[PDB]
Amino acid sequence: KHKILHRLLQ
Amino acid sequence: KHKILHRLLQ
Amino acid sequence: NEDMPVERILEAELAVEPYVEADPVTNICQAADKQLFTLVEWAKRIPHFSELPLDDQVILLRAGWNELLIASFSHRSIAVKDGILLATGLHVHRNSAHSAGVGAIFDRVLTELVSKMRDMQMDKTELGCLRAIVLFNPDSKGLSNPAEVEALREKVYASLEAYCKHKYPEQPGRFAKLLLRLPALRSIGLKCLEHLFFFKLIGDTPIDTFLMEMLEAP
Amino acid sequence: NEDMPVERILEAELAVEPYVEADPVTNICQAADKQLFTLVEWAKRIPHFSELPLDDQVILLRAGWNELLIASFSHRSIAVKDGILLATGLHVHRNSAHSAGVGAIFDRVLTELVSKMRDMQMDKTELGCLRAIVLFNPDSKGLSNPAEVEALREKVYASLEAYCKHKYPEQPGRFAKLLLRLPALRSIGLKCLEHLFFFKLIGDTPIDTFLMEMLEAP
Ligand SMILES: CCN(c1ccc(C(C)C)c(OCCOC)c1)c1ccc(C(=O)O)cn1
Ligand SMILES: CCN(c1ccc(C(C)C)c(OCCOC)c1)c1ccc(C(=O)O)cn1
Q1: So which tissues is this one expressed in (chains C, D)?
Q2: Mutate which of C180, C187, C188 to test chain D, going by most D C-beta atoms within 10 A?
Q3: Whole-Å CA distances, C178 to C80, C121, C173, D99
Q4: Under 8 Å CB-to-CB from C43, ≥6 apart: which residues?
Q5: Does C152 contact ligand 1 (Cβ within 6 A)?
Q6: Buried b (16+ CB within 10 A) or exposed e, D182-206
């Protein structure tokens, strides 16, 4: 879940 | 309007 | 402390606020109706409230009653670990609230308000001052003179800060910690109101006259 | 200021935040989606946020994004009198918001946030600190270590108070005045979310991918 948010926090 | 509240504030 | 003495705010708390297990929601709503009467008596004892125009007194109490009552029963409930203490002398256990369909809002009350009041040992003067800040809400729509209510709010929080600095000088962040429970109180008040409007809509839960009047438009 | 320097919080504001009239609601939602990307970059620049577990970073941003974005566009909008300034370079006039069906929430933004930020001349350091307090919300459900987030919030508000006492010593109530806009921000954030869920439900308003992801459960 929360695919975009996780990618941007990387 | 607000009949009870007005009476109690008296 | 001069124009808004914390001693008088404490006296207001002590004047109005002195268990067996409790549909728990009906009991909770009965206690809310009972405490609306008590709330008017409390507000009359807060310095300068009774000097506002009657229409503004009505506006402030209609805007704030739910947060004011939640703050009171939350602080009352510090004395138990797994429940809320109603003003009617009844305890509502976590399990009872969950079994009646209001578990989520019960949990928010305990986790965001009761437990945090307990953790910091919020005292009755601090509770009363937070409630007086909520009462003197200058954003309440329709006030005749919002700046006058702003000024009264400012007098309360100046008195509260001076009280905290004198009694808890070892805790420099205490005043901010108190104020920073008010967003949670606002959220939980809004959620409680949502539940009450739903209870009114479905019609299966007795709602007494003063609580019903507070659910009238606007 | 040592472990949570206001200079770094200001730098975060300045790094991410640099008009023609704008369905205005579609434009407003497009700007919100754009600013969610910017919000992640802002949060990474707030001291110690990036050191939290990834799962907790996600929890804090999902809990706070709407209040964080509202605080930003409200402060941006101090520069006009009858409108909101979107990050896309578009202005939404009061009349345009009302004619699109979102007049009431527009009015709350201007009356409870923009005008009050303007009245007290809230500066960008103060804005950034209030946003960092909102970001470090220890009540966010599911956090791995709520006490660590509590500690970070405490460091922000201690730094903010010291900043206010140094820059505005003639205004002893300023720190409390700042914190006491957070209940209004919470209310207005909840109302904005209600609108967004309705827009999603009716399906007549484009909602872009990141904004849509923030509207996913939980
Ligand atoms: C805010 C008004 N309200 C009150 C009214 C309705 C509810 C429903 C959501 C159940 C409530 O939910 C609290 C959490 O229940 C799980 C609290 C009360 C109730 C009792 C008292 C009191 O006894 O002091 C004061 N206000
Ligand atoms: C909180 C996310 N949100 C945002 C999203 C949806 C709405 C609807 C209620 C219309 C909104 O309503 C503001 C008042 O409209 C009348 C603001 C925005 C919008 C723009 C920006 C920006 O441009 O910086 C940031 N967040």
Answers
A1: Expressed in lung fibroblasts (at protein level). Expressed in monocytes. Highly expressed in liver, also found in kidney and brain.
A2: C180
A3: 21, 11, 9, 40
A4: C49, C50, C57, C60, C61, C135
A5: no
A6: bbbbbbbbebbeebbeebeeeeebe
